[PDB]
Structures are given as structure tokens and as C-alpha cells.
């Protein structure tokens, strides 16, 4: 059993009122069964797309989840991850300017 | 590595909810160019240069052999579970094979399988034998070693895959030879006595990059934490490197980005 | 192109 390594980030340097894409990437996990959801203020983000299952040379699985969006001030964006190695659903908050 | 072709496949008993149990993906020089899943039941293009340079017969042909492999992996899950005395529960079969054309012209051919994360079996191309990593792989080893499969796999990895790679790489000549300048931002955060400077690189291609933090000019390769190179949706890549420092030494620190698109390494401050 | 495979 292997814990997913997760990081949430944007395609372009974030700027409020500008077209961007939010990405969530989990890697180094097993089994391949994983739940990855991009969310805005606790509610799943619109137009989320994910790549089909892929793995590295060491057989560990990885997935990218990304969705187009426009960043807003006073609005929280996060990536929610569920996996059998995790006792509870893990939430990864996105820092727009860090 | 000059050019690489790689196909990977995954067979799962627990995908799970609404997810395909069988997924198969192809890569040229690292770039995802094709995939197949058990739900769509069709092998499809995942890039423009492959679609523009392949006809309908190509994909029908690729779809057939992906569907044949799907059945193999379907029965393969049952076979291996009986060998391990399972269920069991949830189980996974993985396979990767392909070509590596090295910068000295050397051709490298690999094909290896895995069950439940651990190595199952691999093909030794030079001896034309299959090496069983686990006791449970021995019956599989015997089946494959009997027929003409070894020669067929030898020919594919040394000729067929190589010849197709030579073709794919010319189709994607312009897209693979791309140079994409990274957009770099430096951010600083003050917190309970420590200053954390962040350096993020956005949307660079190709993948290889060196991002490091400098103090007065000298690289701080110890305290710095890196997030590695992670992919974007468009085919470009992303990376971040952070450094912990005493406040306020922000004027002393610099981020050095080293990338193929840059005529000289980029220096960035706070 | 994807290669042909055989039973485990």
C-alpha cells in the first residue's frame, strides 16, 4: 500500500479575473482506485477533466485532474482526495499567490 | 535517450465506480499520443500530429489488438487469482513495453509485467527467455517459452516498434521539438519567525528543468524543498521549489531557472 | 503500433 503524493496548482500564474486552469496531481499510489475532486467553496468545480490511468517504472499509479476556471477573491479552491491508504478524505487547499 | 516508444496497460478488478477496468496508454518521447479503455472500446488519438498522419485502417487495427488484449487480461486476472488462492479481493495486472533509441544509436527493448504492484515477469531479449520474479509466474514462463512467442516479441521490440517510432517522431517533429519558456513567479510568506520564499515555474517544455535557490549567489541545495516536475493539461510541465529563511533576508535570495528554452539561466528575485 | 499478446 502506498500513499498518494498530492499537489494542487494553476497552469498560469494566478490573477483574479483572468482565464486559467486548476490542476490536481496525485502520484506514487497503489491500488489505482482513487477519488480526486476539484472543488470551489466545498462544491465540486465545473468542467473537471481527468487523464486515463498511468504509472511510472516502479508501477506506482498517477493521475492528473484539471478544470478551466477564473480565480475569484474571497473564494476558496481545493483538491479533495480519497484513497484506501488514507483514513479520511484529505483536502489540499490551493494558494493562488504561493 | 534520442527517442522512446512506450505502451502501458492496467487491468483492475476494482477501478472502481463508473471507471473502466482496463486502460491502455501509449507514449512517444514522453508525450501521450494514444489511449484505449474498456468503456469506450476504441483506440483513439490523443494528439493532433498522430491523427493527421494516420488513416481509419490504423485505428481499426489498433482497436482490434487492444480488444484482444483486453480479453487476455480478463482471463489473466482469473488465472493468477487461482494461482495465489484468491479472492483475495481487489487485484491489478500491469504491463509496460517499448523501445528506447539511445543517443549512440543503441536500441533497447523491454517488456515486463506486474501483479498487485510487485514484479511478476520480464522478457530477457538477449537470451530469448522470460524471467519469473515470483514463484507464481513460473507456469506463465513455461507457456510463453514453448511457442514462437519469444521470437515474435524479439522481432517486435527490435524492428516493428523501432520502425514505427521512427515514423511517429517524424509526425511530431514540430510538436516534440518545441521550446516553451517557463513563466516564473516568486512569492514570499511571513510566518511565526520564518520567511518562506516560493519559486514556481509555469508551462515549460521540454520536461527537464533545474530550479534552485541561491543565497548571495551560492546555491542552497540542503534547506530547499522541491515538488518535482508535474504535468499540465496542455502537455507542458510545472515545478515549484521553496526555501526557509530568516526575515528579512529576501534581498539576499535568488531563484535560478535552468531550461532548454532559455539562452541563459533565468535569475529571479523577490 | 500496439503489439499482439498471449494468455498468462
Numbering used by the authors:
A (entry chain B): 2 to 99
B (entry chain A): 4 to 273
C (entry chain C): 1 to 8
Could you pull the original sentences from the published paper?
Critical molecules involved in immune defense can be subject to an evolving molecular arms race with all kinds of pathogens, of which the most famous has led to the multiple loci, high allelic polymorphism and high sequence diversity of major histocompatibility complex (MHC) genes. These genes encode the classical class I and class II (aka MHC-I/II) molecules that bind antigenic peptides and present them for recognition by the T cell receptor (TCR) on T lymphocytes bearing coreceptors CD8 and CD4, respectively. The CD8 dimer exists as a glycoprotein on the T cell surface in two isoforms, CD8αα and CD8αβ. Of further interest is the fact that only the classical class I gene BF2 is expressed at a high level in chickens, and chickens can live or die based on whether pathogen peptides are bound and presented by the dominantly expressed class I molecule, intensifying the selection for appropriate CD8 binding.
However, compared to the pBF2*1501 complex, the α3 domain CD loop of complex A and complex B with intact mesh were pulled towards cCD8αα by approximately 4.2 Å and 3.8 Å in the cCD8αα/pBF2*1501 complex.
